[PDB]
C-alpha cells in the first residue's frame, strides 16, 4: 500500500530532462528510444507557408524527424524545469532554456513533455508528448 | 570521468549484442595491435592460438560459424588499468546456433583509441569455455 522508494514527480522530471539533454548532446541518434508508439513530437520548425511545423507521431516518424534535424554537438542551458503528477500516474514537465545546434548561436525554447508509465515495468516512463518551440519562430 | 564500470558494462552490452546480431562485424571492436585468443580445439581438431589484428580476427570469427549466438551474463568485473585502460572479466553461459549452454570466461583489455574522446578498442580478448 506504500512504495517507500517511488520517485516523486520532481525527481522523475529532473532526471528525465537531464538524461534527455545529455543524450541529445552526445548521441542524438538514440533520442528516439525515449518515445513510445503513438508518441507525439514537434521540435520547432516552419513549413513552406512560414507557419509553425506540425507534429509527427510514433517512434518511426520520430526517429526520421530527429535524424532530419541534424543535431551535432548540441549544447543546452536549462533554465527552468517544473514537473507535476498528471492523471493516470503520468508526469507533465515544463522546460525553458536555450539550445545551440552545431555550435551556432543559442536559441531560447519553451517545451512541454508528458511522461507516462510503460504499462507495468517498475519505475519506467516513456515520452508520450514532446512539444518544443523556439521562441524566435513564434515571438 | 566515466568510471571503469560505466565503460566495461556498456562494452559488454554492445559486444554480446553484436555477437548475436552481426558477428561478421565483431572485428570492428579490435585494432591492428589487438590479440584474440579463443582457447580450445576447432574440429578440425587443431589447438587454439592467438590471432592478431582486425583482418585476421575477422577471418577467425567467421570460421567459428556463429548463428543467433546467445549469451547469459552471470557476472562482470571492470577495473581501471594503467594508461586509462579498462580490464573486464566476464563470466557467463553461451549458446550458439540454439545448442546447449556452456559456461565461459572472457577477459578483455580495453584501450583508448587516442583521437576521439572516450572511444575504446579491444586490445586483448582471451576467451575460454569451462567444460
Amino acid at each position: 500500500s506504500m512504495v517507500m522508494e517511488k520517485p516523486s514527480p520532481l525527481l522523475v522530471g529532473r532526471e528525465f530532462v537531464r538524461q534527455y539533454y545529455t543524450l541529445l548532446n552526445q548521441a542524438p541518434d538514440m533520442l528516439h528510444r525515449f518515445y513510445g508508439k503513438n508518441s507525439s513530437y514537434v521540435h520547432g520548425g516552419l513549413d513552406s507557408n512560414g507557419k509553425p511545423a506540425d507534429a509527427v507521431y510514433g517512434q518511426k516518424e520520430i526517429h526520421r524527424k530527429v535524424m532530419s534535424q541534424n543535431f551535432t554537438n548540441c549544447h543546452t542551458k536549462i533554465r527552468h524545469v517544473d514537473a507535476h503528477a498528471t492523471l493516470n500516474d503520468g508526469v507533465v514537465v515544463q522546460v525553458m532554456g536555450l539550445l545551440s545546434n552545431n555550435n551556432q548561436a543559442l536559441r531560447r525554447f519553451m517545451q512541454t513533455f508528458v511522461l507516462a508509465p510503460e504499462g507495468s515495468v517498475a519505475n519506467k516512463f516513456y515520452v508520450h508528448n514532446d512539444i518544443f518551440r523556439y521562441q524566435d519562430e513564434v515571438f | 570521468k566515466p568510471s571503469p564500470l560505466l565503460v566495461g558494462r556498456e562494452f559488454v552490452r554492445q559486444y554480446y549484442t553484436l555477437l548475436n546480431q552481426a558477428p561478421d562485424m565483431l572485428h570492428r571492436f579490435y585494432g591492428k595491435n589487438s590479440s584474440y585468443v579463443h582457447g580450445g580445439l576447432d574440429s578440425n581438431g587443431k589447438p587454439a592460438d592467438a590471432v592478431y589484428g582486425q583482418k585476421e580476427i575477422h577471418r577467425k570469427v567467421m570460421s567459428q560459424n556463429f548463428t543467433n549466438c546467445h549469451t547469459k551474463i552471470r557476472h562482470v568485473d571492470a577495473h581501471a588499468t594503467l594508461n586509462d585502460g579498462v580490464v573486464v572479466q566476464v563470466m557467463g553461459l553461451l549458446s550458439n546456433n540454439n545448442q546447449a549452454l556452456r559456461r565461459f570466461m572472457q577477459t578483455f583489455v580495453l584501450a583508448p583509441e587516442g583521437s576521439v574522446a572516450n572511444k575504446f578498442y579491444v586490445h586483448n580478448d582471451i576467451f575460454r569455455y569451462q567444460d
Partner: peptide
C-alpha cells in the same frame, strides 16, 4: 529509474560519449 527502452546505466554511458571500435 529509467526512460524509454533504455537499460539502467545505458543513457549515462552513451551520454558520456563512450564508443567502441571503428563502426
Amino acid at each position: 529509474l529509467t526512460f524509454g527502452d533504455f537499460d539502467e546505466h545505458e543513457v549515462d554511458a552513451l551520454a558520456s560519449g563512450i564508443t567502441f571500435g571503428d563502426f
